[PDB]
């Protein structure tokens, strides 16, 4: 199916406590393969997947240079943004950056992303046409003008439509065994009394890859939001994912309900009924 490569960077200011924390991670789809942490020993970009280990020192030296620069840039940024908003050097602030590309099933380019957040909210984002900017406010407008004058969009387009995609293809090949795998969910249901007239039915999806999945509850074969609970998809710690969906029901009515499961490891959607 379709695939993606994304890099995430977090920079956090530590007033009265020295340099800002800087963490970077790179993902192919839902698999992380690289990391950089300002708080760790190496001060280098480190591999977090088997299929990236084969890259030579040229790769590691260069990516280490690159990410350190990202770090420097964000360090200046934090100072700049505090001024933009006339904030004090008492509070800690956060800068977040995310960029990457999507490729369709043909591994051809599909979409490009470059987004920037200050203190947990949109600041400036590159639009889908990769030629224009969305600025959250007038402070971000200043930044927009800077990046239009310096023609940053055009620089990003080259990367997102070229380098980003070409290297994603390379990881997909070298990591074929894992990245091109599809683990279908193992499913089961649980039942718990809530009072003596209500009971909870919980629909479980385990050991699946990738993480994209849909769990819906139907009642008499009709979709049911209402008394339903959907937890955030979670990592098992072994490359697979987990998720459950629950519904509270009147005792004696359990058989009215069915959980439906959609996942690309499943040729046909699963329908589950209690027992």
């Amino acid at each position: 199916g379709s695939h993606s490569m994304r890099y995430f960077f977090t920079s956090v200011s530590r007033p009265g406590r020295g340099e800002p924390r800087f963490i970077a991670v790179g993902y192919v789809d839902d698999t992380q393969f690289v990391r950089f942490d300002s708080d760790a020993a190496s001060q280098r970009m480190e591999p977090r997947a088997p299929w990236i280990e084969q890259e030579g020192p040229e790769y590691w030296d260069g990516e280490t240079r690159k990410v350190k620069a990202h770090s420097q840039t964000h360090r200046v940024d934090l100072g700049t943004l505090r001024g933009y908003y006339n904030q004090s050097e008492a509070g800690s602030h956060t800068v977040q950056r995310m960029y990457g590309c999507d490729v369709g099933s043909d591994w051809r380019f599909l979409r490009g992303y470059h987004q920037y957040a200050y203190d947990g909210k949109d600041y400036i984002a590159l639009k889908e046409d990769l030629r224009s900017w969305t600025a959250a406010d007038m402070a971000a407008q200043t930044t927009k003008h800077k990046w239009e004058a310096a023609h940053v969009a055009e620089q990003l387009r080259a990367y997102l439509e070229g380098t980003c995609v070409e290297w994603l293809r390379r990881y997909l090949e070298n990591g074929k065994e894992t990245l091109q795998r599809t683990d279908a969910p193992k499913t089961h249901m649980t039942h718990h009394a809530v009072s003596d007239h209500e009971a909870t039915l919980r629909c479980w999806a385990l050991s699946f890859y990738p993480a994209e999945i849909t769990l819906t509850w139907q009642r008499d074969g009709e979709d049911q939001t209402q008394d339903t609970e959907l937890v955030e998809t979670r990592p098992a710690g072994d490359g697979t994912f987990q998720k459950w969906a629950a519904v509270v029901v009147p005792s004696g009515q359990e058989q009215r309900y069915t959980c439906h499961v959609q996942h690309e490891g499943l040729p046909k959607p699963l329908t589950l009924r209690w027992e």
């Binding site: 890099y7 790179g26 790769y59 990516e63 690159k66 990410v67 620069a69 990202h70 840039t73 200046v76 940024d77 700049t80 943004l81 933009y84 960029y99 920037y116 600041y123 400036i124 930044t143 800077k146 990046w147 310096a150 940053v152 620089q155 990003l156 990367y159 380098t163 980003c164 290297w167």
Partner: peptide
């Protein structure tokens, strides 16, 4: 492979 476009805000 990461990007080397680093424009400051």
């Amino acid at each position: 492979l990461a990007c080397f476009v680093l424009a400051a805000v």
